[PDB]
Amino acid sequence: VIQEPAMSVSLGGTVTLTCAFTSGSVTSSNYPSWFQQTPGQPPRLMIYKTNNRPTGVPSRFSGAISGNKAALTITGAQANDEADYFCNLYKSSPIALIFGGGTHLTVL
Amino acid sequence: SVAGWILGNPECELLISRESWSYIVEKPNPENGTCYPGHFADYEELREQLSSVS
Amino acid sequence: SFERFEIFPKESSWPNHTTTGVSASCSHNGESSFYKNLLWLTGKNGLYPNLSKSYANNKEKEVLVLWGVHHPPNIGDQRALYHKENAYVSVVSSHYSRKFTPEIAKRPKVRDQEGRINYYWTLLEPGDTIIFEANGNLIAPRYAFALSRGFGSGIINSNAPMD
Amino acid sequence: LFGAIAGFIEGGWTGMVDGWYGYHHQNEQGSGYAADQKSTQNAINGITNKVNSVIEKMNTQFTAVGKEFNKLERRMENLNKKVDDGFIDIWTYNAELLVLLENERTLDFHDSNVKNLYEKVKSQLKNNAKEIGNGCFEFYHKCNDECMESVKNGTYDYPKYSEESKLNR
Amino acid sequence: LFGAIAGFIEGGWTGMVDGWYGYHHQNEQGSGYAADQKSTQNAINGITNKVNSVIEKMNTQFTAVGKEFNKLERRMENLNKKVDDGFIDIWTYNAELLVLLENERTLDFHDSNVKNLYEKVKSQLKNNAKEIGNGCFEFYHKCNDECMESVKNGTYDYPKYSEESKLNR
Amino acid sequence: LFGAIAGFIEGGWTGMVDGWYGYHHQNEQGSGYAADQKSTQNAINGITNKVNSVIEKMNTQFTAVGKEFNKLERRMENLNKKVDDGFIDIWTYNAELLVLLENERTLDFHDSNVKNLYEKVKSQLKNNAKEIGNGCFEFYHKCNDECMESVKNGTYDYPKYSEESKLNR
Amino acid sequence: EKLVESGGGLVQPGGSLRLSCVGSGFTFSSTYINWVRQAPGKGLEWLASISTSGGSTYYADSVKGRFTISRDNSQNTAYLQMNSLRTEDTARYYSARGRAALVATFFTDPMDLWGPGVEVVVSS
Amino acid sequence: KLVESGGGLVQPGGSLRLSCVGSGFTFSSTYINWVRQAPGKGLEWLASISTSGGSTYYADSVKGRFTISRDNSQNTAYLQMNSLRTEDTARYYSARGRAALVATFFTDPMDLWGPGVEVVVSS
Amino acid sequence: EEKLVESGGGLVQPGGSLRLSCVGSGFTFSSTYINWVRQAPGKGLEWLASISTSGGSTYYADSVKGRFTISRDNSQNTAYLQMNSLRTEDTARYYSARGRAALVATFFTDPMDLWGPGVEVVVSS
Incomplete structure (x- = not known):
């Protein structure tokens, strides 16, 4: 599972993070879940099942499948959105849950 | 009230005598009951037994 | 709501009766005492005057009034306590009327006592009165309780911790 | 009752760990278990x-079940016992029978x-x-991951693969 | 449960106003909606x-629920309240759950x-x-109003149209 | 509900007196009825x-239903009558509805x-x-008693009679 | 709702260590329990999971054969038994509950409730 | 029974509103139909309304000019007549549909009829 | 204490008639099939007839079809076997057997678990 190492967005802008497999396609059957972590606080669940927002999550966090790759979109990024974002993918052939590398978002 | 009707209250005699009834219609907090103050022994039993008469 | 109030003040009321009735059965610490809500009346100066004491309910709530009638074991105790040998207790109200006559009988010793005291209670509606008339064998009320019933409940018989 | 769970599908799949019902597919690109999310x-x-x-559905008001009667009041003790x-x-009867029937x-x-x-x-797959x-x-035509996902979604293109299937039938 | 009302027949027919279940046919003589009477x-x-x-099934006898008790009889009032x-x-519980299950x-x-x-x-229509x-x-033969009526009633004649259907199939 | 007992099978068999469900076969060696034991x-x-x-599921404790009240205790008798x-x-309602629903x-x-x-x-028997x-x-091949017993048991051998059926289909 | 992790500390290479995870504020016998570690400077790594009754246990290939996951529903605690520890196991170990529905619990339940974590150091 | 009212003499091009009131039966469990009969001609079905009033049907002759409504609280069904012509002079009846306890359909037979209301369109 | 008792047998002339009664106690008689089996003095058993629980279904062997009629009286807990046109070959001991009936189903093939002591019928001049 490959994520972009780091990307940056401006205040009030829109950024789209990406999660993808090394040798396959990301579908809704992989149940992508996104997590936000500020070192060294515990990870916080952001988006699960590609479109579900837990209570307390700001409405600006949205997800979708953008092809063979999972995508998390932040519309109107604020200063508190500067953190590390991880993607959990579910693989069924070995029955495992795989975390992504992690992407550092820099709000400018 | 049932007490006033069954005791024969002077100010509650306009009621037409009836031979039988199925139930009793009564007002909440009736005005004319026992004109002379006192205690009515076994009142609720009397109201229960007088509810329906053949 | 609950309110323990003195229906008959001990000092003010009972000027012709002794209010120091005390029994060894109701023992606090090592000394002999009595109920905290009842008053034992014994004749003063060798005679027991007739008493007629009344209370009016102005608390806008029901008042629980408790009292008792003393039954000496032998005629000697009754004569030595109330002076008469045929005493009478009368308690009257707009919805409660009862007359008590002392019963002189010998009963098995319970708590080192042969005579018994029968305890009675009544509920006074707002704007009601109660009259106590007796010439002996009266355990007069001292503190009454003003209460308002709230729904229905019960008594749990248990020894569990309370938290 | 419909002859599927223990009928023509003998046993369950311990490898499908993400859904009650689903699919097991096998092609050249690989094999795996997936669940029908809908x-x-x-x-x-x-x-x-x-x-x-x-x-x-069970709404119960505040009440106390216990009641105390003296030895001279036995008809009320027995009436209360009968009620309880x-x-x-x-x-008890209603709860047992209710659970039993809704399990079925x-x-x-x-x-x-x-x-x-x-x-x-x-x-979807007519012939x-x-x-x-x-x-x-079993498919009469080569089937890739895109076609498997089409069958799972409900958008299988029958006219696209009719000629090859007829040739291999 | 049987996959027909919301299964392979997605929607109902607003123009079939003479029954619950029925047929819609289209031939050269015309088209229309009809309901299966049986x-x-x-x-x-x-x-x-x-x-x-x-x-x-709810047969009730003559009874009066109200009952009055004085101040010195509360165990009586509490027992009556418990019963009611x-x-x-x-x-309430039985009626609600019965309605739910019966609707299902x-x-x-x-x-x-x-x-x-x-x-x-x-x-009826084998092939x-x-x-x-x-x-x-879709018929493989011409289906006039008499043939549609036979299909509706249950008296379809397979051998009569078998040869024409085979030619057109 | 499934269209079997009164659907495509109109009536039952009085000659099949060994079970609820079963088979009736006819071949050269003879004809007869049988029951599916499973x-x-x-x-x-x-x-x-x-x-x-x-x-x-109906467990009842010891109880007495009859009570006696003097003529000055009428509210008591009315409460007892209400309870009973x-x-x-x-x-009555529960028993009647329960019987009807289980009969369905x-x-x-x-x-x-x-x-x-x-x-x-x-x-089993496909084409x-x-x-x-x-x-x-109707078999497209000669079906002896052993083959019929295989069909009833569940061990029918389609490949064995595939070619003979194909020649006759 | 709270998950608190215990255990951890300095362990010699090749030793053993048991990590606890006590949950409060929710029914512990109605959700999956997951173990995730984060190395000092690297990303998260899923390690193991356990079913509600403990019947089903899943492990990653990195720690298969060395780690054993157990559960004690009566005591509201879940355990991670670490064996044959190497210096590459030095990480902060989190415990994550799976958002489970009332009627069904699955291995793919989202990890919504986490814990503060415990630091495990494997060094001589 | 059903009783209709609200007719009389109306100039051509005028407006009329008929009303039928049902008693002795539940008015919300049946269909309501309106028919008319010319002095020397036969019956002519005009409009029908569902039990809840959601479904409404008309004949081609009066479609676009007649509107049929319901008021179940007042146990009354209405027939509003717009752009009346001389050809609309007839006796207007109200007919309820015999409905089953479990199902009501547009093809319910017309078993109950009102006395009728005479409508005259003339100058 | 489940048991069956047979009665009504004896010595009859050829061409005569005889009626046998099978009374059962200890079990519900209206819930089991009732069968009749005879055994000749020195030969094997021979199934004769059977009757359903309600008496609606009746079965007979080929040898006694048309001459033997089996009835049932559930109120009196008894089952009957009327034999007519008796012959010398009918000299045998007649048993009554009931079928082991499940709570929910009764069938003609229910095993004959409870038998009676039997009665003796002799046909001779």
């Missing part, structure tokens, strides 16, 4: 509604869901696939 | 019987009726008709 | 469990069993037997 979610919603209907025993008997109903619901899924996939029993369907 | 009448009889069983509240709770069973009954009618028409999905059959 | 035994076990669930009448009404469910269960037996036999409609299959 059917599983509908079943979950239905069962949640059933359980909440059974649970939250009758209520306990009614509630839930199992039949799952059986119907599996059977309907099987019928849907049969309808481009051969039935082998065991809930499985 | 299935609709049986469904009506069954649902009427069910409603009457629910309603008229328990009866109310039992009846009625919907399943209608689904089964539609599915059985479709299966009957399928069994003289093509299934398009949506519950609809 | 399905009949499963149905018997299920119905016995249902009847015992209805019966044994309410319990009788609840039990048992017949539905038998329908499902017969339809599942038909579907199992249908799956090796045509469907004559009312519950029978």
Whole structure:
């Protein structure tokens, strides 16, 4: 599972993070879940099942499948959105849950 | 009230005598009951037994 | 709501009766005492005057009034306590009327006592009165309780911790 | 009742760890287990509604069951005992029978869901696939991951693969 | 439960206003909506019987619920309140759950009726008709109003049109 | 509900006196009736469990229903009558509705069993037997008693009679 | 709702260590329990999971054969038994509950409730 | 029974509103139909309304000019007549549909009829 | 204490008639099939007739078809076997057997678990 190492967005802008497999396609059957972590606080669940927002999550966090790759979109990024974002993918052939590398978002 | 009707209250005699009834219609907090103050022994039993008469 | 109030003040009321009735059965610490809500009346100066004491309910709530009638074991105790040998207790109200006559009988010793005291209670509606008339064998009320019933409940018989 | 859970699909799949019902596919690109999210979610919603209907339908007011009577009041002791025993008997019988019957109903619901899924996939693949029993369907045409996802979604293109299937039939 | 009302027949027919279940046909002589009298009448009889069983099975005797007790008799009032509240709770729970389960069973009954009618028409037209999905059959032969009426009634003549269907298939 | 007992099978058999469900075969060696022991035994076990669930779930404690009240205790007698009448009404309604609903469910269960037996036999003999409609299959090959017993048991050998059926199909 | 992790500390290479995870505020016998570690400077790594009754246990290939996951529903605690520890196991170990529905619990339940974590150091 | 009212003499091009009131039966469990009969001609079905009033049907002759409504609280069904012509002079009846307890359909037989209301369109 | 008792047998002339009664106690008689079996003095058993629980279904062997009629009286807990046109070959001991009936189903093939002591019928001049 490959994520972009780091990307940056401006205040009030829109950024789209990406999660993808090394040798396959990301579908809704992989149940992508996104997590936000500020070192060294515990990870916080952001988006699960590609479109579900837990209570307390700001409405600006949205997800979708953008092809063979999972995508998390932040519309109107604020200063508190500067953190590390991880993607959990579910693989069924070995029955495992795989975390992504992690992407550092820099709000400018 | 049932007490006033069954005791024969002077100010509650306009009621037409009836031979039988199925139930009793009564007002909440009736005005004319026992004109002379006192205690009515076994009142609720009397109201229960007088509810329906053949 | 609950309110323990003195229906008959001990000092003010009972000027012709002794209010120091005390029994060894109701023992606090090592000394002999009595109920905290009842008053034992014994004749003063060798005679027991007739008493007629009344209370009016102005608390806008029901008042629980408790009292008792003393039954000496032998005629000697009754004569030595109330002076008469045929005493009478009368308690009257707009919805409660009862007359008590002392019963002189010998009963098995319970708590080192042969005579018994029968305890009675009544509920006074707002704007009601109660009259106590007796010439002996009266355990007069001292503190009454003003209460308002709230729904229905019960008594749990248990020894569990309370938290 | 519908002959699917223990009928022509003999056993369950311990490898599908993400849904009540689903698919097992095998092609050149690989094999794996996947679950039909729509059917599983509908079943979950239905069962949640059933359980909440059974649970939250019981609204009880404040009351005390205990009552005290003296030795000179035995008809009231026995009347209270009769009331309590009758209520306990009614509630026990109703609860037992209710759970017993809705267990059947839930199992039949799952059986119907599996059977309907099987019928849907049969309808999509009219004669481009051969039935082998065991809930499985062998393809007369090469089938890739895109086509498997089309069958799972419900957008299988029958006219696209009709000629190859007819040749291989 | 049978995959017909919300299964392969997605929507109902607003223009078929003479029954619950029925047919829609289209030939050269014209098109129209008709209802199956037998299935609709049986469904009506069954649902009427069910409603009457629910309603008229409640036989109640003459009784008065109200009861008055004085201040010195509260164990009496509390027992009466317990009896009344328990009866109310039992009846509320039973009525609500009965209505829910009976609604489910009625919907399943209608689904089964539609599915059985479709299966009957399928069994009549063995291979003289093509299934398009949506519950609809395309004939391999010319089907005039008499033939449509025979299909509706249950007196379809397979051997009469077998040769023409084979030629056109 | 499944269209088997009164659907494509119009009536039952009086000559099959050994079970609830079964087969009737006709070949050169003769004809006769038989019963499917597996399905009949499963149905018997299920119905016995249902009847015992209805019966044994009612556990009653020792009680006396009669009470005596003097003429000055009338509210008492009215409360006792209310309790008894309410319990009788609840039990009558529950018993009647319960019997009606299980009477529906048992017949539905038998329908499902017969339809599942038909579907199992249908799956085994694929294009090796045509469907004559009312519950029978016409073999395209010579079927001896051993082959019939294989069909009933569940171990039919389609490849063995595939070619002979193809030549006659 | 709270998950608190215990255990951990300095362990010699090749030793053993048991990590606890006590949950409060929710029914512990109605959700999956997951173990995730984060190395000092690297990303998260899923390690193991356990079913509600403990019947089903899943492990990653990195720690298969060395780690054993257990559960004690009566005591509201879940355990991670670490064996044959190497210096590459030095990480902060979190415990994550799966958002489970009332009627069904699955291995793919989202990890919504986490814990503060415990630091495990494997060094000589 | 059913009783209709609200007719009389109306100039051509005028407006009229008929009203039928049902008693002795539940008015919300049956269909309501309106027919008219010319002095020397036969019956002519005009409009029908469902039990809840959601479904409404008309004949081609009066479609676009007549509107049929319901008021179940007042146990009354209405027939509003717009752009009346001389050809609309007839006796207007109200007919209820025999409905089953479990199902009501547009093809329910018309078993109950009102006395009728005479409508005259003339100058 | 389940048991069956047979009665009504004896010595009859050829061409005569005889009626046998099978009374059962200890079990519900209206819930089991009732069968009749005879055994000749020195030969094997021979199934004769059977009757359903309600008496609606009746079965007979080929040898006694048309001459033997089996009835049932559930109120009196008895089952009957009327034999007519008796012959010398009918000299045998007649048993009554009931079928082991399940709570939910009764069938003609229910095993004959409870038998009676039997009665003796002799046909001679």
